[PDB]
Amino acid sequence: NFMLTQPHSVSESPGKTVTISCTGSSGSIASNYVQWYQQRPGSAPTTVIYEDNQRPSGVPDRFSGSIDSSSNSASLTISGLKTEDEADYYCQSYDSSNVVFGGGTKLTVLGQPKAAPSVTLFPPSSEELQANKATLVCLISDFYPGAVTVAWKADSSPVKAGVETTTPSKQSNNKYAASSYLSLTPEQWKSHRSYSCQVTHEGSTVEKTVAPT
C-alpha cells in the first residue's frame, strides 16, 4: 500500500528555479532508490536523473535531486527553465518486489502570443450539391492561445443546427489549429444572398464572406 504522492500542476516563469516533490505514504524515501522520468507528449519516456544525486550523461547540470527522509518527500530541483523542458515528471520507487510510479507533474509551458488567425472559407461544392447536401467549412490555423469562439452568420437567418466546431489542436510549428462546419440544405444555401463566418480571438475579429457564384 505504498504510493508516491506527486503534485499535478507546477507552473513557473522561465529562468527561475523550481522544486518538484514526490512524497511516499508508508515506506520511507530513503529505503529505496527514486528515479525521475521526463517524457515528451506522444513519445517514449526518458530517464532524467537516477540514484538521487547523480545525472546521466546527456542531460544538463540543471537537473538536481535532493532527499530529505524526515518528511518522506523526494525532491527534484530544476533551475533555468527553457522551452524544451515542458513535460510530465514521474518518480519511481520499488517498495518490495513491486515497482510503484508517481502521480505525475506536467511541467507547464514557459514570449509573444503568436496570434495569426488564418480564417479561410470555402463554399459548398457542386458535387455536394448534386448529392442534396451542402456544408460550409470555417478554418482557423496558426493562432494562439487556443481559445476561439465561432458563430456562423448570414443575411436573414442561417440555420442554427449543423454548427460543428473542433477544439484547438497543436500544429507542427507550435501553433494551434481548429475547424468549424455548417451542415446546410441546398435550398437554404441559395435562400440567403451570402454567408459569413467570423472568429473572435483576443478581442480582434477576422471575417470573410462567401456567396453562391
Partner 1 sequence: KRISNCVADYSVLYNSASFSTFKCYGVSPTKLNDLCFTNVYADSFVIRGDEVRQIAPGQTGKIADYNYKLPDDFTGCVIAWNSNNLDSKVGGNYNYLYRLFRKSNLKPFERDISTEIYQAGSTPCNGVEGFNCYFPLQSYGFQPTNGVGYQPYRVVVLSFELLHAPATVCGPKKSTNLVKNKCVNFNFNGLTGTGV
Partner 2 sequence: QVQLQESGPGLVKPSETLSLTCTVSGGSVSSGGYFWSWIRQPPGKGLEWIGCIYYSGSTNYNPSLKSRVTISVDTSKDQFSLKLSSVTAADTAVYYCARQLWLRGRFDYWGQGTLVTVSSASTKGPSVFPLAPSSKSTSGGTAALGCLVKDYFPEPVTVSWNSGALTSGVHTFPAVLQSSGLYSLSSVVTVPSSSLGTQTYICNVNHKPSNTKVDKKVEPKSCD
* Contact set with partner 1 (CB under 8 A): 7-11, 26, 28, 30-33, 51, 54, 69, 96-97, 108, 110, 112, 145
Under the binding rule (CB under 8 A), the answer on residue 209 touching partner 2 is: yes
Contacts of 138 (CB under 8 A, 6+ apart): 119, 121, 150, 152, 165, 179, 180, 181, 182, 197, 199
Cα 77 off chain centre by: 24
Cα dist from 190 to 90, 133, 134, 186, 193, whole Å? 57, 13, 11, 7, 7
d(CA 25, CA 2): 6
Of 53 and 194, the one with the shorter C-beta distance to partner 1 is 53
Span near partner 2 by CB under 8 A; candidates 15-23, 63-71, 72-80, 176-184: 176-184
Smallest distance from its own copies to CB 25, Å: 5
Query: Which amino acid, residue 206?
Result: V
Under the binding rule (CB under 8 A), the answer on residue 164 touching partner 2 is: yes
Span near partner 2 by CB under 8 A; candidates 21-29, 64-72, 86-94, 144-152: 86-94
For the record, the C-alpha cell of 113 comes out as: 502570443
Residue 149, class by beta-carbon neighbours within 10 Å (0-12 exposed, 13-18 middle, 19+ buried)? exposed
Question: Interface with partner 2 by CB under 8 A: which residues?
Answer: 6, 32-33, 35, 37, 39, 43-47, 50-51, 56, 88, 90, 92, 94, 97-104, 118-128, 131, 133, 135, 137, 139, 141, 161-162, 164-167, 169, 171, 177-179, 181, 183, 208-210, 213
